[PDB]
Structures are given as structure tokens and as C-alpha cells.
Amino acid sequence: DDDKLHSQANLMRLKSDLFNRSPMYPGPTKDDPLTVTLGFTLQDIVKADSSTNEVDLVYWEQQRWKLNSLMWDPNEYGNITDFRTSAADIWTPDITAYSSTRPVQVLSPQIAVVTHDGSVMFIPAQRLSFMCDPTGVDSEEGATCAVKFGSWVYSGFEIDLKTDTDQVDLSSYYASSKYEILSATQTKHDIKYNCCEEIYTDVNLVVKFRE
Amino acid sequence: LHSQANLMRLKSDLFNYPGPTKDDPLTVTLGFTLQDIVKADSSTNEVDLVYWEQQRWKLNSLMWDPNEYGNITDFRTSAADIWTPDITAYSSTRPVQVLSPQIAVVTHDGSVMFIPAQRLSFMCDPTGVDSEEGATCAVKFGSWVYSGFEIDLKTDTDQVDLSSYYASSKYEILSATQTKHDIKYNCCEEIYTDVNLVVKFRER
Amino acid sequence: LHSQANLMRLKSDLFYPGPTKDDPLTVTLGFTLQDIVKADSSTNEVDLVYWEQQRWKLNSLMWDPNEYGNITDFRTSAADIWTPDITAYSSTRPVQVLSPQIAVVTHDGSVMFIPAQRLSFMCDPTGVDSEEGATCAVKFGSWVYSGFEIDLKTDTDQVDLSSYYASSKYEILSATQTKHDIKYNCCEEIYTDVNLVVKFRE
Amino acid sequence: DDKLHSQANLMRLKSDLFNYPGPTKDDPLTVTLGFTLQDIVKADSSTNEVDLVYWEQQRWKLNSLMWDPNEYGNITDFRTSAADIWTPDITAYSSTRPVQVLSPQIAVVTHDGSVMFIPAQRLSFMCDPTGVDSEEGATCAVKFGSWVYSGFEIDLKTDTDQVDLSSYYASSKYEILSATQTKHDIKYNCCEEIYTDVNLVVKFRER
Amino acid sequence: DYKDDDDKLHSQANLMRLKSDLFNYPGPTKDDPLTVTLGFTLQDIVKADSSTNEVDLVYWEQQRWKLNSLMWDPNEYGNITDFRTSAADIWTPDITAYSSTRPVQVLSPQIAVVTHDGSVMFIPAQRLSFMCDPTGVDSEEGATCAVKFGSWVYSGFEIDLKTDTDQVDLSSYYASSKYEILSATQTKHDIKYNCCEEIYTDVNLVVKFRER
Ligand SMILES: CN(C)CCOc1cncc(N2C[C@@H]3CNC[C@@H](C3)C2)c1
Numbered sequence A: 001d002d003d004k005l006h007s008q009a010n011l012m013r014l015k016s017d018l019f020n021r022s023p024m025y026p027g028p029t030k031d032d033p034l035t036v037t038l039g040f041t042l043q044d045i046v047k048a049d050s051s052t053n054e055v056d057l058v059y060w061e062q063q064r065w066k067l068n069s070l071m072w073d074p075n076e077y078g079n080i081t082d083f084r085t086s087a088a089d090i091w092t093p094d095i096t097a098y099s100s101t102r103p104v105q106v107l108s109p110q111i112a113v114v115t116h117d118g119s120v121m122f123i124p125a126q127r128l129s130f131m132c133d134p135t136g137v138d139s140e141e142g143a144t145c146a147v148k149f150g151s152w153v154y155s156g157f158e159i160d161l162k163t164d165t166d167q168v169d170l171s172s173y174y175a176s177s178k179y180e181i182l183s184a185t186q187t188k189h190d191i192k193y194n195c196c197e198e199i200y201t202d203v204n205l206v207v208k209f210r211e
Numbered sequence B: 001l002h003s004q005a006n007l008m009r010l011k012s013d014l015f016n017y018p019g020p021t022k023d024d025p026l027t028v029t030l031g032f033t034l035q036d037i038v039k040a041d042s043s044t045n046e047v048d049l050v051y052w053e054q055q056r057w058k059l060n061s062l063m064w065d066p067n068e069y070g071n072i073t074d075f076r077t078s079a080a081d082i083w084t085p086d087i088t089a090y091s092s093t094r095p096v097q098v099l100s101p102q103i104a105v106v107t108h109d110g111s112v113m114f115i116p117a118q119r120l121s122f123m124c125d126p127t128g129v130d131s132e133e134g135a136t137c138a139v140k141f142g143s144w145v146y147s148g149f150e151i152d153l154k155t156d157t158d159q160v161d162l163s164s165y166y167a168s169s170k171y172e173i174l175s176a177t178q179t180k181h182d183i184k185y186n187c188c189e190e191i192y193t194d195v196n197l198v199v200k201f202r203e204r
Numbered sequence C: 001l002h003s004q005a006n007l008m009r010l011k012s013d014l015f016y017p018g019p020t021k022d023d024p025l026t027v028t029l030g031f032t033l034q035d036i037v038k039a040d041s042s043t044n045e046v047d048l049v050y051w052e053q054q055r056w057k058l059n060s061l062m063w064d065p066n067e068y069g070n071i072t073d074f075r076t077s078a079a080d081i082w083t084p085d086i087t088a089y090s091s092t093r094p095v096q097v098l099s100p101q102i103a104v105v106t107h108d109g110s111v112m113f114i115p116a117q118r119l120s121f122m123c124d125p126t127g128v129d130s131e132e133g134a135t136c137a138v139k140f141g142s143w144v145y146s147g148f149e150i151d152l153k154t155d156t157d158q159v160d161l162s163s164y165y166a167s168s169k170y171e172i173l174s175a176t177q178t179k180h181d182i183k184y185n186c187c188e189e190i191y192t193d194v195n196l197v198v199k200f201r202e
Numbered sequence D: 001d002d003k004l005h006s007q008a009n010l011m012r013l014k015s016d017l018f019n020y021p022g023p024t025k026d027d028p029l030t031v032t033l034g035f036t037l038q039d040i041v042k043a044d045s046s047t048n049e050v051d052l053v054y055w056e057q058q059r060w061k062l063n064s065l066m067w068d069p070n071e072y073g074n075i076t077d078f079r080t081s082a083a084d085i086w087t088p089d090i091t092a093y094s095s096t097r098p099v100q101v102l103s104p105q106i107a108v109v110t111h112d113g114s115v116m117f118i119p120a121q122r123l124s125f126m127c128d129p130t131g132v133d134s135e136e137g138a139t140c141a142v143k144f145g146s147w148v149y150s151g152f153e154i155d156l157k158t159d160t161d162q163v164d165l166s167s168y169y170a171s172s173k174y175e176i177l178s179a180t181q182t183k184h185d186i187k188y189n190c191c192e193e194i195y196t197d198v199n200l201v202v203k204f205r206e207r
Numbered sequence E: 001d002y003k004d005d006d007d008k009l010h011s012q013a014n015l016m017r018l019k020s021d022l023f024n025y026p027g028p029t030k031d032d033p034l035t036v037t038l039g040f041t042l043q044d045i046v047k048a049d050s051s052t053n054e055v056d057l058v059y060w061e062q063q064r065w066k067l068n069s070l071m072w073d074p075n076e077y078g079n080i081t082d083f084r085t086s087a088a089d090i091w092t093p094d095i096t097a098y099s100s101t102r103p104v105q106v107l108s109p110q111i112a113v114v115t116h117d118g119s120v121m122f123i124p125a126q127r128l129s130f131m132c133d134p135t136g137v138d139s140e141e142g143a144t145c146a147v148k149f150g151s152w153v154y155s156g157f158e159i160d161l162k163t164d165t166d167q168v169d170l171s172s173y174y175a176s177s178k179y180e181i182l183s184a185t186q187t188k189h190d191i192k193y194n195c196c197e198e199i200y201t202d203v204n205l206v207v208k209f210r211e212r
């Protein structure tokens, strides 16, 4: 009862200390670059449209980064080791699919988890329409498509993009989807664009699937 | 007149809680009323439900003595002015659509009641819907970022309220249940909790 | 010049927490049915375009026009005053607003708010291709206020059909609007709704 | 250098001017309304909806927005987000979907106090397209007026009764045989007051 | 490494200082016009609908301009040469498509990059339905359609519109699209409208395309 509110007080003090008694992280820079880790969990291939060459994917995008300005010692705060916060209240990376054909639709609350070492985990579930030719989807070899994800405005010198893991997480894939996944990989690459001198980094998701 | 000033004073006293923690966990009670299965799509394996999701919780920081506030026992408030649980369907295929105003009722004991009516599109293979046994589909609900140690889910009953179900729907309900379940991953040490909505239905 | 200053003065002087059991509010509801746009026998949704007239009066919005350059009415954004949370109880999509979200406040404290809306709602259209046509119902009322806080009334039980689109695919045989009180399982308090009953055919 | 002084004159103007609550019976307003019909996208005979893209030209004048260009570096016009000023609540009276806005919600103010706001919009409205595959084509109408202001607070006029057809898409699926816009005054059953609208009448057929 | 740590601390401090300095330009005028450079990269023709004569495109729209009020010396700010800002925090040109049939849908974060010389780069990826007759698309010479982009409320005497090439960039065009691009050009034009006396300027995007 009284312990309960002391617990609420500790968490309010921690959020107020982090968000008001110190400047908020303004984003990475060439001199203070930020490593962002990216992982994908494929939940469902909803639809493959061979008349427009678009395919609709439900998936979770795991994003992790780590910030000194979000560190704290649990001993000073009632041994709290995590807290949740609205993703809008903090800096988040601008990860963007580079071949979507519709705005991404958000299916989960936009809430980040901050742990006392300053690491942030943000995992939005989304529905994504992207460019994909499903020719071959009704064959044993299936069809193969790809879509890559990376910052839109930060170079590879500002956001250092990495995959958490080599393997796409298929463990939550909808068993009764119209489409089975034959394989999926996620791979970092560097690339230059015509507009710009600076090098950019993306993670390429390649998926082989079939009916 | 005096009534109105008491209600305003009460809101100011309350409004001028940071979420549940492991040391101060919150019990949120969930209940579903199923109003309609609008549509079942066998080309994409998506089914569309209209339901009311009853949510209830209780916070010491929302309690007040009615005697000190004109004997006021409830008030209405925008869901955006108070903390609310992040209950999410775990297998929707479209953003859930809200069909009712985003207003909660707070009662003097600190209990909150919030009942959004929603249209949900979710992952469901409707094969067998045109047979006697129908099709069977399932969708889990629970917090997106809180574990069973911060947000404790429960139901008052395993029976989905079917008393309001649209009598001329394309699809009739054969059974609909809502079961709390506690799960442990070996990845992680904490308990996790969801309410599994299982619907058996077939064409009328 | 002097009137603009009066109007600005009036609004600043006026600028209510919503109704309560001690201070209940009567809200008057009426419907003008514009069009039955579409009937979908594959999902049993039907789409209506209608006007929803809402009316209520508040002492805290009363003024004497002679104290304010003889102003008798003004316009305000519906977001700047309390409005009733009238909800369609059997929609299948979020209702789509078709008109500006503005109310008119009159010096006696009455407020008039008339949103034009497009609604999809649960409705089986079998029979629509016959002489007797199909019948469907949709009820409207506060979502969170009991009949002890919002007292729902109509001026008439007949839906205004005088604006009904003469070249709609569907003709209105009849349309009624009726107040009723409802108990729900969740809640001890009684709720009040207006039930819209419409018989229509191709 | 002089360009920095010009930016300061603009900021001074916007600041001064922004230090009007809408029209009333004692201070009414006449809004000029015209339509630039761009395209009939779609006629649906299974619901009797038709989809237009058009430009809706709105023009009004307020003394409180007048200024002398001599005082402000000869600036004659500035731009402002349409949310930061009063704009009329012109509404189609028989749309079946929310109007979709296609152009930026920015208005233009001129030193004589005139305001021009011209949203490009896509509208679905109640229209029976029967006859559109014949030589006579189909005729449909949809009227535009204030929702909440009577003729004595907002009046309308048109500069012409002919709709501007000079931007009409020449490869549309539908060709326009005529398009008029005509002011009327009307009463409704809810309300004592007289409302004003401009009725847009369009005769069209398949190309 | 203690040095390495507060090197990072001072970098963040320099970035916030620079942003505070710059934020603590009201648009162009006839006396102080602004030149905007406009260029398109075409990513995909998604869909051509011959029943409504609408076609859907995914492209990048590159907008560039330069302001003296956005200049700074890096030496005074820890050698910072760029920063990111929400496009809502700065003035941006109201470049609009003139024949869209649906609200244009943005696909990229609404963020601009500002560089120490005062130039701003803003590149929204967009999906667009515009008026287009796809007759011919099932033929060797394909179909030809055009959509023009430019300010909606600023005349050519306020926003001076310019390309820095006539060729639409096709190096990112989706190679497995339903449609192949035969050619794509971007060309500035001036024009007068019935409403208004002032002259307006835009960039016309002409695309010739056919079924793959
Ligand atoms: C030159 N400079 C330092 C300003 C960089 O400003 C930009 C602002 N917005 C988008 C981009 N890009 C657009 C494509 C998609 N994102 C990766 C590439 C190519 C960069 C660049």
C-alpha cells in the first residue's frame, strides 16, 4: 500500500530524472555514431497480387540501440531495471522500407522498453505492401522477393546498422497462411545513391515462398 | 451548479500514475462481447469481427471519498487523460478500427471501466465454414510490452457474451470462449499472459 | 468593428463538465435520411447517408444579447464545447463525417449540432427485391452516459424523408425513430437509445 | 542584403496583422465561389455515386486584412496556413464519402484584404449515371454552401454561371457536354433561416 | 577513452547548440524569390487502370533550396556539416501534383537534411494516383502519360522552379514491375490560369511505358 506508492514514486523520479534533468539524446552524428540492430519476425504473407506485383507482409521489426543518456543504477531507484515509454517521447531510428508501395500500417502499440544499461528495444508489428513479382508461387520452387530496410536520412557514418542475427525469425509464422515460407535471410549492405556522396546502409530481407 | 464545481474540483485533485511495475503490478480484467462476424475471406485467410472489449482495472490514485466531492460516485474522462492498458490482438492483419468514443468511466473506489467497440481483421483460415462443424479460428489478446509480472490478465468467465450477436449475420456462432493462459518462455524468466479468443462458426 | 469586439467578448466570457446524476441533461435527436447508398448481401452491411440533429440547452451558455451588441447566435468548433457521445450501436466501420464539425449556440443556451454522416451497419437486405422490401434497424445513443445523465428524446417518431435522394437505388417505404431504455449485462444503470427502423426496397 | 530586409517586412506584416471571429448578421460576408472541373473519374451505376476531381475557388475580403504595401516594402501578397485564419465552411450537400483534399491547405492574402483559397478536391456524390452511354448523356447535380451560416451571415455569388472547363482532362473516360453553377436561396425544415448554395449541374457522357 | 567519451558528449552539445542558435525564414516573396531544384527518381509503375484512366506511381521527389539563414561555420560547431530536422519545423515548398486523383501518400520519414552552406535537401518517397489513359500499354511503343508538379499558391515570381537534368532517374526502377519504362523526362513549364493574373511554373513528368 505505502510500499506500492513508494514504487510509483521511484519510477516517476527515474523518468523525471532522465527526461527533464538532462538533455535528451538529439540523434547520432558523424562524431557520435549509433549502432542500430535490426531483426525481422515474419508472421504472415497475407496476399500476393500478380496484377500489380505487390505482396502484403505482416511482420515484427525488432529494433535495438543503446544510449549512455538512458543509463541508470537500479540501486538509486528501488531496484527498477526496466520501464516503458511512448516511442514518440524518445529518439527512434527512421527505419524505412525502400520499396514499399503503400504507407506502412501499424498493428501494435508504439511503446519502447528501456533497460538500466541504456539499451532500448522497440518492436512494432506492421503490415507492409512492397514490390514483389509472385511468378512461380504455384510451383515447387516458389517465388523469391526482397525488400530492404534502412535509415532514410542518416548515412552509414551516423547510424551503424547491423542485424541481430543471420536468420529471419520464422517461429511465429502463421501455420495456416495461404503461403508457406521456404526461406528468409536478412543481410546488411552498403550502397551509394545518385543524389548524394555519402554511403548508406540497409538490411536486405530476402524471402522464398510458395502457395 | 454546486454539482458541476464539485466534479471539476475532483478532476483537478486527481489530475494535478506511471504504469504498473513488478513491485506494483496491475490486474486488468478482460471480457468480449461478440456482435458480428462480418466477413470471412478464403483468398487471404482473414476474418473480420465486430466486438466490444470490456476492460476493467482499479488504481489507488483514482480513489476519492464522495463525501468530500458532493457525493459524486463516477465521472467520464477521455481515455487520453488516464493511463490505459496496451491490450493488443497478436495476429491482426489490419489496424483495428474503433467504433465507439474513447471515453472511460472512473468510479470512486478507483476502478476504471473502458469498453471500446472495435472491428478486427485477423489471421483465420475459414475452410469448413460451409459444413456442419464449421470453421474454428483463434486470436490472442494481451499487453504488447508488459509481462505477466506487471500486468496480470484475468476474465470473469470463459464464455464470450453472445447475447448481442447479430441474428441475421452471414455466420452463426457455434461456440466462443475466452481463456486466460499463463505461459513461460525459456528465453525469459517472467510469466506471460494472454486471453485466447476461440470462435467456432459456420454459414447460416 | 464593435460587433467583432462584442462577439470576441461574448466568447471569452463564456470560455461545463458534462451531465451528471445531479445535473442531468436532455438531448433531442432526429434523423434526416438522405440516401441508402449500397446494400451488400455478401456481408449484410448497408450504407446510409443521413443528418443527425442533436439539441441541448445549458445555463452556462446563456447570455443577454443587449449586453453583447444584440448578438443572438454564434458558431464554435465542436471540439471547443461538450458534445454528446451519440454512437451507432451496430456499425461495422467507423462512421464517416460529411459536414464541418461546428455547432451553433443560441443566447438561451441551446446548442444545435447537425453532423452529416455515412454509416455502415449490420443489416440483412433479403427481400429488398420484392414489394414488401427489407427491414433493418440501427439504434443510436450515448455510449458512456446512462439515461440518468443523458435524457434522450425525439420531437417525432417519423424520420425526415423530405430530402431523400429521388434517384437512389432504393426507395424508402417507411422510416421510424423511437426512444427505448436498455439494460446491459456489464452495468446496473439503464441506458437510452433512439432506434431507427427503415423499410426499403429497390 | 536587401533580401533580408524583405524577409523582415514580411515577418513584420504577418506579426502586425495577426495581433476576426467570422461573419455575423451585423457584419456579413459575400464569398465568391467558382468551380474548375478537372475530371470525372468514375460513374458507379450499382450505387449511383459519381467521382469528380475539381478545384473550388473561394474568395472573400476582410478589412482587418488590409495593409499599405508602402509601409511593408511593397509586399502585396502573403501566404498563410488555412488553419490559422477563418475560412468559410463550404460543403457539398449530397456527398457520399468525406471529400478528399489534394492540394496544400494554404490561403493567399492580398493587400486589399482579399483572401483566395482554392482547394483541389475529389468528391463522391449522389448521381444516377443512366444514359451516359447515349448521345444525350447523363445529367447530375450537387450543390455547395455553408453548413452552419445562413444567407445573412455568408452569402455567395458566382462571377459566371459557366463552370471553368479549361483544365478538364482531355482523355477522361467522360466528356463534359455542359456544366453550370447557379446560386439559389433555400430553407430547411430544422431551421427558420435562409441558406444559400451554388448548384453545380453537369451533363456528361462516355468518351 | 575518457577523452573519447566526452568527445561524444561535446558532439551532442555542439549539435544542440547549433540547432538552438538556428531556431532561436518566413518564405519567399517577389523581392526575395527562392529557386527550388526539382528532380524525380521513378521506382515503380504499380498499376494502370483503364476503367478509370488512373495510373499509380512510386517515385522519389528531390527538392533542393539554399538559405542564408541556414548557413553556419562548422569550426564554430565542432565541425558539424549537416543536421536533420522535421520538415514541419522549417519552411518547405508546397510542391503539388496537378492531376492527382487521390491524396498523395508519403512513404518516407518527413525529415529534411540541412547542410552548413544553407542548402536544404528533402526527398519524400511518394505513391501517386494521377490522370492517365493507358491506351497503348499493350503495344511496342507503349502508352504516354504526363503529370506536372509545382507550387500550389506561389507564383513563378516567388518560387523559381528548376531542374538540373531533363532525364528522370531510372537507375532504381523496379526490374520486375508489371510495366517497363521506355522513357521519362522532366521539363519546366510556365502557365497562366483563369483565376489569376500571376504566372505559375511547374515541372512536367512525361513517362512512356508498356507491359513487360
Ligand atoms: C547530401 N546530403 C548530406 C543531404 C542528404 O539528404 C537526404 C534527405 N532525404 C533523403 C535522402 N536520401 C534519399 C534516398 C533514400 N535514402 C537514402 C539516400 C537516397 C539519401 C538524403
Ligand SMILES: CN(C)CCOc1cncc(N2C[C@@H]3CNC[C@@H](C3)C2)c1
Pocket (backbone or CB within 6 Å): B074, B103, B104, B105, B107, B113, B114, B115, C142, C143, C144, C184, C186, C187, C188, C189, C191
Ligand atoms: C458501471 N459504470 C457506472 C461504468 C460504466 O462504464 C462504461 C464505460 N464504457 C462503456 C460502457 N457501456 C458499454 C456498452 C455500450 N454502451 C452502453 C453500455 C454497454 C455501457 C460502460
Ligand SMILES: CN(C)CCOc1cncc(N2C[C@@H]3CNC[C@@H](C3)C2)c1
Pocket (backbone or CB within 6 Å): C073, C102, C103, C104, C106, C112, C113, C114, D146, D147, D148, D188, D190, D191, D192, D195
Ligand atoms: C437555429 N440556429 C441558429 C441553429 C442552426 O444551426 C445549425 C447547426 N448545424 C447545422 C445546421 N443545418 C444543417 C443542414 C444543412 N445546412 C443548412 C441547414 C440544414 C442548417 C444548422
Ligand SMILES: CN(C)CCOc1cncc(N2C[C@@H]3CNC[C@@H](C3)C2)c1
Pocket (backbone or CB within 6 Å): D055, D077, D106, D107, D108, D110, D116, D117, D118, E151, E152, E153, E193, E195, E196, E197, E198, E200
Ligand atoms: C490572385 N492571387 C494573388 C491569389 C492566388 O491565390 C491562390 C490560392 N490558392 C490556389 C491558387 N491557385 C490554384 C490553382 C493551382 N495553382 C495554380 C493556380 C490555379 C493558382 C491561387
